[PDB]
Design a protein around this ligand. Structure first.
Ligand SMILES: [Mg+2]
Ligand SMILES: [Mg+2]
Ligand SMILES: [Mg+2]
Ligand SMILES: [Mg+2]
Ligand SMILES: [Mg+2]
Ligand SMILES: [Mg+2]
Ligand SMILES: [Mg+2]
Ligand SMILES: [Mg+2]
Ligand SMILES: [Mg+2]
Ligand SMILES: [Mg+2]
Ligand SMILES: [Mg+2]
Ligand SMILES: [Mg+2]
Lengths: 200, 115, 134, 122, 90, 128
RNA sequence: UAUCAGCUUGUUGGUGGGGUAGUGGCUUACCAAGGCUUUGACGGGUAGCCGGCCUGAGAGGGUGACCGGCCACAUUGGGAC
RNA sequence: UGGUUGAUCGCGUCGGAAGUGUAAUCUUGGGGCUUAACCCUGAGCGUGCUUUCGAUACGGGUUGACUUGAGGAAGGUAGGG
């Protein structure tokens, strides 16, 4: 119920950097496997499916839960892709990643599932915990000196925190100013393509 | 030219050339191009981003394309509707449609200035 | 024999508009005169007139003069009969039809006389959906 | 038709032909192999397709295909019969579920094993 | 004088119809017609039902338009009573 | 006899009762003549909402409460208004009150010791 | 379902009695000849009904598990206490 | 199924009001289970029905006109009917 295999293979297949940089993605222009350099047809399904899989492997969400997110966004009022990206960003592991306390979303999932975090006073070990507005995520007092935590404390200045979060790095406290908007989620997929895909 | 009231069709239409009937309806923003392959390609090239298109009649690609084409040609832009009726857009056309046109135009203004 | 004089009016108007005739004429009835009046007030025809019989000397004649814009352009994009004699259509104040996404007008006969949908909705009154002229 | 015609006599749908009557509303049915043999396919095509006349527990006797390279079932072998048509075989509308009851999984399978009842090999 | 909750309110069912059988004693079969939409095609149909009323004195004849009021079961099939005759077509 | 009793609802190991009015013969979780209140005992200082006017009407018309409903009416004070008895009538204590906006505004500004204990944990990694 | 067209004689109505918690051919005596039906009676087939469930843009189509309401039944048939 | 029109009824039709449409489900707003499923709670829905008060354009009922549809009279008239 969690993808544990290599991520560079998925990034190469999907054609975009799922996470990180300056890595084995120097072989980017071609998917993994023996048949990587051949010319591709890329149907509309192919395109749509690529966008959906890009979002899925970026956020570490499997198909059933991603589908559930899709119906929630579709029911919600407003743009379906905007709401879907808003939900995926409101996931707690992504919140930790965006605040910059984790090197990657996989590391954020690791620490969240291991329970190194407090949500507004209550301990949460659910990576899919949907953080609500005005929430206060806190690092567990016992685990305020994790090696990944201190690496993040050394590196966060380079990292860019989105406008909808406030982070007290050394304190391990992520204040949620508001639930993010499409202009605030970084554009790296085609949510419109995903929405069109979930209609066929 | 195709009249778009803010990234979507102005009003529902039904076009038909030979035997290729294509139905088009406007959709709320974010709905996407819910259309079959040929009609969807026609709409995506025309620039419509929120539309519901159904293909009635024959499924031949050429005829379906012509039906989508004359369905779009049947579109009647609100200002020219007002000219037709000898009235004003505020007197003939829905306030929600006109408003959505203003927000589309202004968001367009934002994008242009940002360039 | 004649069954729906309202449908006869609508088809006469449609055929004349298609053939680019400037005027069309028909036997007069009160409901036909009302529909012609609201068509004129909504701008789908140039004008209308009820004439006392002088050729057949039998009954009043309703005559509609149509309008074509610059470069001979139709002012009527179509007209359709809804409440047929075979099957009659009645709409409530909440389920009032929308024509051409609101650009066209449905003609509804309400208890307060002939009223275009927009009007009816404002008065929260329904009735018989006569036509969908757009 | 006119509205009055529709009122007097309404629309009637089609019959919606059934495909596997012998199963009698069951996903698969148990049967006994009353005959095991081979049949030539229709044309085009050419082979020795392995089939069996089976008396299913519904009391109906039908011809069932035996998929996979390999075959052990014989006279009076208890089998499970599921739906499934063999296109180049007139009169065959059922297949025998490998790996269930007397019939056993295809010997040298390593791909699509579950469809032929082959247990995973260490 | 001071009777109990008067009015009784509780009013009974009333039907206007046409007499189609008067040839049994103290009984008239009334045909009552109602107009309803067709459930699927929306046309306004005409639904007709035969109601047996109780006509004391046999005051109504064939083709008479009558008014009946529902009552308690007066026989195996009679459940209505004649209250007036509206048109005596004769 | 007409009873005022509890109709069980909710999950396994999480009961929420509806104080309802129905006759004795009816099954426990069935159609009720009227729903009067609710009773959540799983929650802190159990929630007890009872419609005073309706419960007074049903007591005065002769509905017989179950012992549980008698306890709830004692706590709501209805069992004293009807069948006047000297009982404490301990109207439910509230199950306290949290808040979110005030805490967020308190911490947004908290700043100071937020990043301050934060550089103290910097000294901690030093100690780490 | 018309490749089922006639069905019914306590049957339809009336009066008196009886009976019942109660109206009533519910029952009885007498009198009358009605009652239902091509807008489908009678017969055959299938079926517990519904709140709902699934699907569907909707209209509809399929369905009647859990849960809830009504009904029917308790080895088969009948009967009362 | 219904040409033109006067009057009237207010059955269809339309608009209010009251009653009803249990609960659960369902839609939606809040709340609780570490999240979710799930659960609680407010509202909507419950597409109808009954009662009642209005409106009268249209459909229909009742009733009276009109002649243009339809039929008839008189005269004219063609034809392997
Ligand atoms: Mg065609
Ligand atoms: Mg008697
Ligand atoms: Mg059965
Ligand atoms: Mg059913
Ligand atoms: Mg049950
Ligand atoms: Mg008429
Ligand atoms: Mg009139
Ligand atoms: Mg609820
Ligand atoms: Mg919660
Ligand atoms: Mg309900
Ligand atoms: Mg009339
Ligand atoms: Mg002659």
């Amino acid at each position: 119920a969690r993808y544990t295999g290599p991520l560079t293979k998925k990034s190469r297949r999907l054609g975009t950097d799922l996470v990180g940089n300056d890595k084995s993605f120097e072989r980017r222009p071609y998917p993994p496997g023996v048949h990587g350099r051949g010319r591709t047809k890329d149907s509309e399904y192919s395109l749509q499916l690529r966008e959906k899989q890009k979002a899925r492997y970026a956020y570490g969400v499997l198909e059933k839960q991603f589908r559930r997110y899709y119906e929630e966004a579709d029911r919600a009022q407003g743009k379906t892709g905007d709401v879907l990206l808003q939900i995926l960003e409101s996931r707690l592991d992504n919140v930790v990643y965006r605040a910059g306390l984790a090197a990657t979303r996989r590391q954020a999932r690791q620490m969240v599932s291991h329970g190194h975090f407090l949500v507004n006073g209550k301990k949460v070990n659910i990576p899919s915990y949907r953080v609500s507005t005005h929430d206060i995520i806190d690092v567990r007092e016992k685990s305020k000196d994790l090696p990944p935590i201190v690496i993040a404390r050394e590196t966060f200045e380079t990292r860019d925190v989105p406008a909808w979060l406030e982070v007290r790095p050394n304190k391990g406290r992520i204040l949620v100013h508001q639930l993010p908007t499409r202009d605030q989620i970084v554009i790296d997929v085609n949510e419109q393509a995903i929405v069109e895909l979930y209609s066929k | 030219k195709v009249p778009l009231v803010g990234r979507t069709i102005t009003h529902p239409v039904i076009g038909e050339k030979a035997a290729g009937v294509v139905m088009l309806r406007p959709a709320s923003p974010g709905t996407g191009v819910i259309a079959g392959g040929s009609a969807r390609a026609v709409l995506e090239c025309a620039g419509v981003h929120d539309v519901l298109a159904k293909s009635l009649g024959s499924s031949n690609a050429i005829n379906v394309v012509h039906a989508t084409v004359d369905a779009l040609q049947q579109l009647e832009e609100p200002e020219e509707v007002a000219r037709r009726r000898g009235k004003s857009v505020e007197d003939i056309a829905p306030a929600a449609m006109l408003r959505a046109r203003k927000e589309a135009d202004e968001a367009a203004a934002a994008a242009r200035m940002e360039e | 024999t004649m069954t729906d004089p309202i449908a006869d009016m609508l088809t006469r108007l449609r055929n004349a508009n298609q053939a680019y005739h400037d005027q069309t004429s028909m036997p007069h009835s009160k409901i036909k005169a009302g529909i012609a009046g609201i068509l004129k007030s909504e701008g789908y025809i140039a004008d209308y007139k009820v004439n006392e019989p002088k050729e057949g000397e039998v009954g009043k004649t309703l005559t509609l003069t149509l309008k074509y814009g610059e470069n001979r352009e139709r002012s009527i994009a179509g007209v359709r009969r809804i409440s047929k004699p075979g099957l009659r259509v009645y709409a409530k104040s909440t389920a009032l039809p929308k024509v051409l996404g609101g650009l066209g007008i449905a003609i509804i006969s309400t208890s307060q006389g002939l009223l275009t949908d927009k009007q009816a909705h404002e008065k929260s009154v329904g009735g018989e959906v006569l036509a969908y002229v757009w | 038709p006119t509205i009055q015609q529709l009122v007097r006599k309404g629309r009637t749908d089609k019959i919606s032909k059934n495909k596997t009557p012998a199963l009698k509303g069951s996903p698969q049915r148990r049967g006994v192999c009353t005959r095991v043999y081979t049949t030539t396919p229709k044309k085009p095509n050419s082979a020795l397709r392995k089939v069996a006349r089976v008396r299913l527990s519904s009391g109906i006797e039908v011809t069932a295909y035996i998929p996979g390279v390999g075959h052990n079932l014989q006279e009076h072998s208890m089998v499970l019969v599921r739906g499934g048509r063999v296109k180049d075989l007139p009169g065959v509308r059922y297949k025998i579920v490998r790996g269930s009851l007397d019939t056993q999984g295809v010997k040298g399978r390593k791909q699509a094993r579950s469809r032929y009842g082959a247990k995973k090999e260490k | 004088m001071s009777e109990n909750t008067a009015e009784r309110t509780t009013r009974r069912k009333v039907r206007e119809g046409l007499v189609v059988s008067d040839k049994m004693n103290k009984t008239i079969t009334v045909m009552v017609e109602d107009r309803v939409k067709h459930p699927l095609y929306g046309k306004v149909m005409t639904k007709s039902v035969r109601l047996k009323a109780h006509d004391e004195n046999n005051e109504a004849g064939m083709g008479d338009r009558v008014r009946i009021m529902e009552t308690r079961p007066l026989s195996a099939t009679k459940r209505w009573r004649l209250v007036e005759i509206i048109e005596k077509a004769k | 006899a007409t009873k005022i009793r509890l109709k069980r609802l909710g999950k396994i190991r999480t009961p929420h009762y509806r104080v309802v009015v129905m006759d004795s013969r009816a099954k426990r979780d069935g159609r009720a003549i009227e729903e009067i209140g609710q009773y959540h005992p799983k929650a802190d200082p159990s929630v007890i909402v009872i419609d005073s006017e309706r419960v007074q009407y049903w007591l005065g018309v002769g509905a017989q409460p179950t012992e549980a409903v008698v306890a709830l009416l004692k706590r709501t004070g209805d069992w004293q208004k009807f069948t006047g008895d000297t009982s404490p009538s301990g109207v439910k204590p509230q199950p306290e009150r949290p808040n979110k906006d005030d805490l967020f505004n308190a911490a947004l500004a908290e700043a100071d010791e937020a990043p301050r204990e934060a550089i103290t944990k910097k000294s901690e990694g030093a100690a780490a």
